[PDB]
Amino acid sequence: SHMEAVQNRIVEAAERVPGVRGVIHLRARYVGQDIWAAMIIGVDPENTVEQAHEICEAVQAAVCGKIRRIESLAVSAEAREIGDTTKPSF
Amino acid sequence: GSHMEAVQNRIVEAAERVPGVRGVIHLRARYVGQDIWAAMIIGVDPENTVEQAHEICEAVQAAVCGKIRRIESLAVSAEAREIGDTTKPSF
């Protein structure tokens, strides 16, 4: 819950990137005042593997751009169906 | 860790038989208790769909977990790999 606000900022940043259907999972830790994090995003299942990689790169740039305290971020992509409203796991 | 090395090679060989696997990019394996927990990244055609790539991952899981009894957990994820790429698996 001391992680809560920052996790929500990261999710919100990622979810405003074109091609992102939602964030599936986010592992984030503080190390001092820097953040290290790994995120799984959901994308159209009919995107190609190369398309999905591009969206992952876009999320990395956007999230790091908005949340400057992030020192390291990994992003990976999995299939998500268009009406899935399942909340992110943390 | 010659014994774990041996196990790793057996996982790679089982994975690389699976249709759609261009090669294993990465494998991390370790004992958690007396079982093995492992995570592997496989290389696949970049033109696969995400859902296609997932099925290949599930095919690999079934194949590996069927040959190596001691693996309790195996996570498999897919990344783009070009067809003539030669880089061997990393550990």
Residue numbers in the entry:
A (entry chain B): 212 to 301
B (entry chain A): 211 to 301
Question: Would you copy out the relevant sentences from the publication that reported this structure?
Answer:
To gain a better understanding of the contribution of these binding sites to protein function two double alanine point mutations were also analyzed. In vivo the introduction of double point mutations in the central putative binding site (D249A and H285A) resulted in decreased Cmag values similar to D249A. Although the average particle number per cell was almost identical between the D249A and the D249A + H285A strains, the latter strain produced particles with significantly reduced mean diameters (−12%, P<0.001, Mann-Whitney test). In addition, this strain also showed a slower restoration of its magnetic response upon induction of biomineralization by adding iron back to iron-starved cells. ITC results for the central putative binding site double mutant (D249A and H285A) displayed a reduced number of binding sites (1.8±0.2) in reference to the wild-type data and therefore suggests that a single cation binds to each peripheral binding site. To confirm that these observed phenotypic differences are due to true transport function alternations, we also examined the expression levels of all MamM mutants, their ability to stabilize MamB expression, performed MD simulations for dimer stability evaluation and determined their CTD structures. (ii) All mutants exhibited an apo-MamM CTD-like behavior along the MD simulations, and (iii) an absence of structural differences was observed.
One of the most highly conserved and abundant integral MM proteins is the CDF transporter MamM. MamM was recently proposed to function as a magnetosome-directed iron transporter required for iron biomineralization since its deletion abolished magnetite biomineralization and mutation of residues within the conserved TMD metal-binding site resulted in alterations of magnetite crystal size, morphology and even mineral phase. To summarize our results we present an alternative model for the CDF CTD mode of action, in which we propose that upon metal cation binding, the CTD induces conformational changes towards a tighter and more compact fold which allows the activation of iron transport through the TMD.
